């Protein structure tokens, strides 16, 4: 074994889609993209993936590569996919709180922010309609904070159990450069599933504003298989683009 932190992140992002079946995988960052395509070439061949613009890929290409297509997915049709539920998006996040409320819109007051990003984008529709996971390349207390400034992604404490309009909400995983997490802690709170090799519990605790459920008992992220390492290193990311987006 000579596996890098980025390669553990890659297989953890592939594991996001374990059991996903025949749905659209929409990774919105390089590591989740390697992960989705790694899953598609190993245990989830029926995933749908696009070129990020408007074409559905038949084969699974290297990062930044073209492949023969199998269908058409312009932006207006993506919104049909979202409403249908047959999708699992992996979004980035500027802030994520203990219940999975997420912010990628802006910092500060809603009508006069202190820092502007893209706005809510599809985060509200994604989180209310279908499985949503998050990727954080630099796990810090500024990202994992007690309160997000703007709720662009719906967290578990927003759910009205009396209103079935909320029944499709499901935040599946948070993968960071430190480990794998979900919101399966008590009261749907942020919970450690594994820490990547070399990461200590104290390092996670020191870089998370709130308590991480199960942190003391979390095991180590699994080893990639030889096949996964071949696919990452030879097929999907030969140019080491993964290393640019993973901190330490």
């Amino acid at each position: 074994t000579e596996v890098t932190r980025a390669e553990y992140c890659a297989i953890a992002c592939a594991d996001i889609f374990s059991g996903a079946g025949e749905i659209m995988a929409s990774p919105m960052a390089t590591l989740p993209l390697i992960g989705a395509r790694l899953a598609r070439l190993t245990t989830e061949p029926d995933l749908l993936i696009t070129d990020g613009e408007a074409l559905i890929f038949a084969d699974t290409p290297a990062v930044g590569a073209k492949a023969p297509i199998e269908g058409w997915m312009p932006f207006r049709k993506v919104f049909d996919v979202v409403a249908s539920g047959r999708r699992h998006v992996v979004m980035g996040a500027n802030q994520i709180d203990r219940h999975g409320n997420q912010n990628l819109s802006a910092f500060g007051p809603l009508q006069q922010p202190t820092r502007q990003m893209f706005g809510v984008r599809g985060a509200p529709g994604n989180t209310i309609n279908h499985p949503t996971s998050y990727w954080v390349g630099k796990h810090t207390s500024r990202v994992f904070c007690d309160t997000v400034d703007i709720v662009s992604g719906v967290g578990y404490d927003q759910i009205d159990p009396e209103n079935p309009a909320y029944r499709f909400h499901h935040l599946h995983r948070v993968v960071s450069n430190l480990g794998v997490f979900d919101f399966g802690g008590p009261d749907h709170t942020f919970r450690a599933l594994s820490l990547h090799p070399g990461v200590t519990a104290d390092q996670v605790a020191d870089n998370t504003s709130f308590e991480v459920a199960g942190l003391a008992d979390a095991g180590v992220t699994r080893e990639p298989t030889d096949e996964e390492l071949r696919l990452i290193r030879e097929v999907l990311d030969p140019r080491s683009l993964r290393d640019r987006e993973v901190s330490v």
Binding site: E53, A54, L55, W72, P74, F75, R76, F79, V82, A83, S105, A106, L110, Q111, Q112, P113, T114, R115, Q116, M117, F118, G119, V120, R121, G122, A123, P124, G125, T127, I128, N129, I150, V151, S152, G153, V154, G155, Q158, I159, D160, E162, N163, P164, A165, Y166, F168, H169
Partner: protein
């Protein structure tokens, strides 16, 4: 007898606009924006606008001119470097505009409601999110008159119609009556913007004969018919510096020059004097000379 000849100039089209209008702008981010029509807006005195857009440098340029009062959008993005529009950012951090920011799917839904002359359409997107706080009482819910199988009735966002006074869109080909087509992989939502609006202006790369239009593209690319257009403007390179399907890609170097020029008074004044203070022909000549360094 003849069908109406809708060919007009860029300034003619903006001459039909009024301060205080709600204007939808087609394209998406830095993709097939009606940038020539936006530049014609900048040269005019039309202001106090409510803008409905999948925002890009169209909204940035309008913000740079103080012409935006209120903005309805799903995002604002330049798509490529430097990604964030600096003028939207400045307007936001200065509190110069009111925003009704919303989920991307809610924009499409609102335009669909307006297209169908409906006051609302129900949608899940928005529930549980701060879209509710961006809108306050302007965004209400609606409860299904049919309960689900469990016996519980769903309460959904009632997305209000995004009725527009005017729509500005850019397409690749059209005839002089407003039949128009896109080329490339995505129509975006320009047909919906036109259907949602009272006054509809389409700029096109080239005006062609109807028969030329319909033999150049598949049936499915004829996304505007004559009932959806009031004025047709021939504007070659009229989406610059955004991409435009099969016609051309994004002028990445010029987009970076636009964004960097926002950073200082001297740089922006120079950008204004060089690119935004003459005709579209003056702009295209200056962009050509920029390309040759």
């Amino acid at each position: 007898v003849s069908k109406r000849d809708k060919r007009i100039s860029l300034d003619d089209a903006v001459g039909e606009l009024r301060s205080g209008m709600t204007i939808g702008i087609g394209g998406w981010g830095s993709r097939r924006k009606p940038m020539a029509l936006v530049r014609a807006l900048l040269r005019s005195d039309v202001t106090d606008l409510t803008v409905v857009t999948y925002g890009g440098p169209d909204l940035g340029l309008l913000c740079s001119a103080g012409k935006v009062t209120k903005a309805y959008y799903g995002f604002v993005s330049l798509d490529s470097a430097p990604f964030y529009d600096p003028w939207f950012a400045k307007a936001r951090t200065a509190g110069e505009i009111a925003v009704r920011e919303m989920d991307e799917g809610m924009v499409k839904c609102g335009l669909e409601a307006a297209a169908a002359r409906l006051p609302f359409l129900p949608i899940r997107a928005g529930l549980g999110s701060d879209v509710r706080r961006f809108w306050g009482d302007e965004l209400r819910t609606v409860t299904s008159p049919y309960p689900d199988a469990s016996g519980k009735s769903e309460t959904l966002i009632a997305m209000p119609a995004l009725n527009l006074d005017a729509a500005l869109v850019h397409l690749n080909l059209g005839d002089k009556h407003g039949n128009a087509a896109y080329t490339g992989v995505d129509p975006y939502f320009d047909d919906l913007y036109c259907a949602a609006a009272e006054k509809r202006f389409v700029s096109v790369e080239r005006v062609v004969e109807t028969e030329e239009l319909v033999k150049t593209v598949p049936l499915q690319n004829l996304i505007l018919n004559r009932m959806m257009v009031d004025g047709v403007v021939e504007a070659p390179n009229g989406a610059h510096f955004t991409l435009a399907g099969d016609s051309y890609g994004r002028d990445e170097k010029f987009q970076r020059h636009y964004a960097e020029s926002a950073k200082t008074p001297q740089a922006w004044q120079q950008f204004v004097a060089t690119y935004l203070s003459g005709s579209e022909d003056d702009y295209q000549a200056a962009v050509k000379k920029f390309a040759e360094e």
